[PDB]
Design a protein around this nucleic acid. Structure first.
Ligand code: NA
Ligand code: NA
Length: 327
DNA sequence: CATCTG
DNA sequence: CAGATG
């Protein structure tokens, strides 16, 4: 956690680059388990040889750790941090819609900067385009002060459309966090479930409303169950308009809400721990449901849930207020 | 995993 | 449809 930091970090630097720049998924994947192992390793790595001992620990990595431990740097890491090409990919990538794949193409085309991008706005797709339009806005964190404002609107409109909808703002917003990055709304309707054959409108209906009122501004992507968009808090009294915020709306059968809800709330750590105990207490948890574990190895069947309570209950545990859902 | 593109 | 992005 601090004993093998530099090492683990460099490796991550190394792993990152392999995938994003080069296409080395194997290599990439190498640096990964490696840092993962040195990550848990209880001692102070004092040498390559020492490390090499570890699994995932090859000679090349060793080699690397040596130079690092040996000198406070790594030549390769040094070359890469310069390499404008590498750099470019790292950057171009910040743009929503631009993955690495994309990144390489543009670069080999010579599109390297933000300006490069505008000049060639033709070459980008819609997402890619919104992404560009709101680069800053996008990168700007979201303050709970505004978070509550957003929540307010969304929830009110969802109400008007149908009294039977159930919306929920999951995320760290939900775990108390002072600022979030984007807004995740989980949605269900009684009339929707596991077996219940579809009802897209169920999602489309609200989408429309939010745009109606101008909350939603653009569409990133819009399917039958997941909407990816852009929204905005109505600039009050002209002087201070809001930033553009990322927002997702997703439909879920009412029959697997809370699990989702639980799940989307996090944190990853809470989940795990909650997930493990689940296992102890003779159960299973995942994104959509909790199931009684069979002894034959495993087994299934939908445990019926009406709240985040019912879940915990099953695993006989203390209801955790979302704030303390931290770890 | 669900959506988009081409 | 394989493939990319979130
Ligand atoms: Na991107
Ligand atoms: Na292939």
């Amino acid at each position: 956690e601090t004993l093998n930091g530099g090492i683990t970090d460099m490796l991550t630097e190394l792993a990152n680059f392999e995938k994003n720049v080069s296409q080395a998924i194997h290599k990439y994947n190498a640096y990964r388990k490696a840092a993962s192992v040195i990550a848990k390793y209880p001692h102070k790595i004092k040498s390559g040889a020492e490390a090499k001992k570890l699994p995932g620990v090859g000679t090349k990595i060793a080699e690397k750790i040596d130079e690092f431990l040996a000198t406070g740097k790594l030549r390769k890491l040094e070359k890469i941090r310069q390499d404008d090409t590498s750099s470019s990919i790292n950057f171009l990538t910040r743009v929503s819609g631009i993955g690495p794949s994309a990144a390489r193409k543009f670069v080999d085309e010579g599109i390297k900067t933000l300006e490069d991008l505008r000049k060639n706005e033709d070459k980008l797709n819609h997402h890619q385009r919104i992404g560009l339009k709101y680069f800053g806005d996008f990168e700007k964190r979201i303050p709970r002060e505004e978070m509550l404002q957003m929540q307010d609107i969304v929830l009110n409109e969802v109400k008007k459309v149908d009294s039977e909808y159930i919306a929920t703002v999951c995320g760290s917003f939900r775990r108390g966090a002072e600022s979030s990055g984007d807004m995740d709304v989980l949605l269900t309707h009684p009339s929707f479930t596991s077996e219940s054959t579809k009802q897209p409108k169920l999602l489309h209906q609200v989408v429309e409303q939010l745009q109606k009122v101008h909350f939603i501004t653009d569409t990133l992507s819009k399917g039958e169950t997941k909407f990816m968009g852009v929204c905005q808090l109505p600039s009050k009294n002209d002087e201070k308009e809001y930033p553009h915020r990322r927002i997702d709306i997703r439909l879920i059968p009412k029959d697997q809400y809370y699990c989702g809800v639980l799940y989307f709330t996090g944190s990853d750590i809470f989940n795990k721990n909650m997930r493990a105990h689940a296992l102890e207490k003779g159960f299973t948890i995942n994104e959509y449901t909790i199931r009684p574990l069979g002894v034959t190895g495993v087994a299934g069947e939908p445990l019926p849930v009406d709240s985040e309570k019912d879940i915990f209950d099953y695993i006989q545990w203390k209801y955790r207020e979302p704030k303390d859902r931290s770890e």
